[PDB]
Amino acid sequence: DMANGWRGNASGSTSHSGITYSADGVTFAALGDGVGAVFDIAMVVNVSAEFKASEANLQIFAQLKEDWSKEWDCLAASSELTDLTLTCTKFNQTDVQVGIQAKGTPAGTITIKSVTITAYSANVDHLRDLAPSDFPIGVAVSNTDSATYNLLTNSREQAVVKKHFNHLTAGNIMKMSYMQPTEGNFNFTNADAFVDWATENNMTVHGHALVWHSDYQVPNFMKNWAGSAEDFLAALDTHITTIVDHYEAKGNLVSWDVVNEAIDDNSPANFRTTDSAFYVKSGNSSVYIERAFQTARAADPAVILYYNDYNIEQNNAKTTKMVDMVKDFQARSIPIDGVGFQMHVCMNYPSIANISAAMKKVVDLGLLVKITELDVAVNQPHCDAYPANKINPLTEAAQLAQKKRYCDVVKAYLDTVPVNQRGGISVWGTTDANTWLDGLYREQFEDEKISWPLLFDNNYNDKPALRGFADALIGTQCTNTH
Ligand code: NA
Numbered sequence: 001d002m003a004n005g006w007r008g009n010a011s012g013s014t015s016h017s018g019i020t021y022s023a024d025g026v027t028f029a030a031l032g033d034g035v036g037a038v039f040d041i042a043m044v045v046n047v048s049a050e051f052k053a054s055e056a057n058l059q060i061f062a063q064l065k066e067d068w069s070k071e072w073d074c075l076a077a078s079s080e081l082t083d084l085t086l087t088c089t090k091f092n093q094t095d096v097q098v099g100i101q102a103k104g105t106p107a108g109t110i111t112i113k114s115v116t117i118t119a120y121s122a123n124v125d126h127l128r129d130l131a132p133s134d135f136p137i138g139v140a141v142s143n144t145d146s147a148t149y150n151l152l153t154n155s156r157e158q159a160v161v162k163k164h165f166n167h168l169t170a171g172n173i174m175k176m177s178y179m180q181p182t183e184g185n186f187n188f189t190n191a192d193a194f195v196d197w198a199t200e201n202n203m204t205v206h207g208h209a210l211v212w213h214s215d216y217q218v219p220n221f222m223k224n225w226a227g228s229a230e231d232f233l234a235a236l237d238t239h240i241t242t243i244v245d246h247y248e249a250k251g252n253l254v255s256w257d258v259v260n261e262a263i264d265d266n267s268p269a270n271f272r273t274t275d276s277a278f279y280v281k282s283g284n285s286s287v288y289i290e291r292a293f294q295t296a297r298a299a300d301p302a303v304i305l306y307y308n309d310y311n312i313e314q315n316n317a318k319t320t321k322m323v324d325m326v327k328d329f330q331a332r333s334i335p336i337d338g339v340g341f342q343m344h345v346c347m348n349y350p351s352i353a354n355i356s357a358a359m360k361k362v363v364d365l366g367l368l369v370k371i372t373e374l375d376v377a378v379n380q381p382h383c384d385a386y387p388a389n390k391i392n393p394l395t396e397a398a399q400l401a402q403k404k405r406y407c408d409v410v411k412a413y414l415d416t417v418p419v420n421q422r423g424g425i426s427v428w429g430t431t432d433a434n435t436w437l438d439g440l441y442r443e444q445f446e447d448e449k450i451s452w453p454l455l456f457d458n459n460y461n462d463k464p465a466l467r468g469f470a471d472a473l474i475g476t477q478c479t480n481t482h
């Protein structure tokens with residue numbers, strides 16, 4: 001604020017002549033030693049020719065008001081001056097006077113253009129090493145799809161991933177049109193480079209995803225299919241067989257999301273129709289779902305086959321349709337080894353009782369239960385009556401609520417899923433600086449990055465979320481306190 005609150009100040013015997021407000025900021029006449037300008041609680045400045053000639057220095061300073069003697073250390077010498085940038089760094093008490101003053105035998109004027117003024121540890125060495133049985137502790141990464149966040153070019157991503165995880169999912173580059181952009185032209189280069197790095201680092205890879213209706217990654221030739229239903233289904237088989245066979249041979253790819261998000265968001269729930277190219281191009285049929293599983297099993301009988309979805313942890317209509325599908329597949333000998341609960345949850349919804357009940361329904365059918373995409377939104381437009389209780393900026397209370405919530409979810413997973421049915425827990429991203437949720441809810445969020453849903457902050461430092469996750473793994477009581 002360079003248009004309100006500024007004062008002339010004299011620390012020496014020479015009187016000041018106040019300040020002048022202009023479009024440039026705040027100016028004062030450097031009348032003598034200790035004459036300056038201050039405001040109440042890093043600068044940009046431009047000094048006059050008479051000031052440089054004077055040989056006088058500039059002193060940024062701060063002092064407690066009325067207890068005046070208590071930060072003399074700062075100094076910008078005349079020789080450092082010619083529009084410059086000047087920075088300055090007992091400070092905390094429960095009124096502070098700050099500014100800059102001329103030192104020496106000054107003359108001319110000083111214009112100040114701007115002024116701005118500006119570490120938690122979870123004490124977890126390696127999150128993966130705390131797992132009470134040998135199940136994957138995993139993370140989604142960016143690859144060539146993000147110039148900024150690509151695992152293979154971003155050394156901060158590499159460091160956090162190496163430190164804590166032992167299992168990886170590609171955020172986008174193993175999706176359908178990324179693997180087969182045009183008919184018959186498969187592209188394995190970038191995803192092979194990713195798998196190689198995982199292998200080099202003793203991490204296994206979860207493949208995401210063989211079949212998924214989301215329009216931006218449906219291959220154009222599939223979206224625009226103009227042939228028969230059976231030839232479409234034959235094309236879908238070729239897509240799956242080529243990719244599964246290839247990754248079987250590469251090694252280190254242990255499980256696939258075979259079909260992702262085939263169930264609608266209605267109540268009661270049904271398989272997707274008009275919004276799925278797979279339903280429409282198969283001739284208005286959901287036979288492609290079971291077929292994809294059969295085709296994937298034939299291509300690599302050892303790879304673990306998941307059906308993956310969101311909201312199936314809520315224990316309502318979507319959960320029911322998912323369970324009915326699994327039972328139907330079992331009754332008809334359609335191969336399926338596990339269910340992936342994406343687990344994109346809110347802070348207070350759905351309840352741990354419901355999440356646990358939903359996972360247990362899959363446990364009781366003898367299948368693996370894998371948490372594939374866990375994150376915990378601090379703000380989420382469908383939760384806690386948003387925006388009535390919007391949290392912005394992020395607070396310590398919300399970070400501690402998030403610690404408890406991560407702990408509660410991981411504990412529920414451990415309490416519900418027997419050792420040999422644990423397919424893993426993975427979180428959907430590393431740093432809050434790059435969560436998918438901020439883009440997904442950008443309209444509701446008014447383009448602000450306010451979901452803060454992951455284990456590490458924008459600087460890759462630990463959040464209490466990480467401590468909550470570890471607390472669950474070690475059987476420590478889940479709390480929202482340090
Ligand atoms: Na592993």
Ligand code: NA
Binds near residue numbers: 245
């Ligand atoms: Na094969």
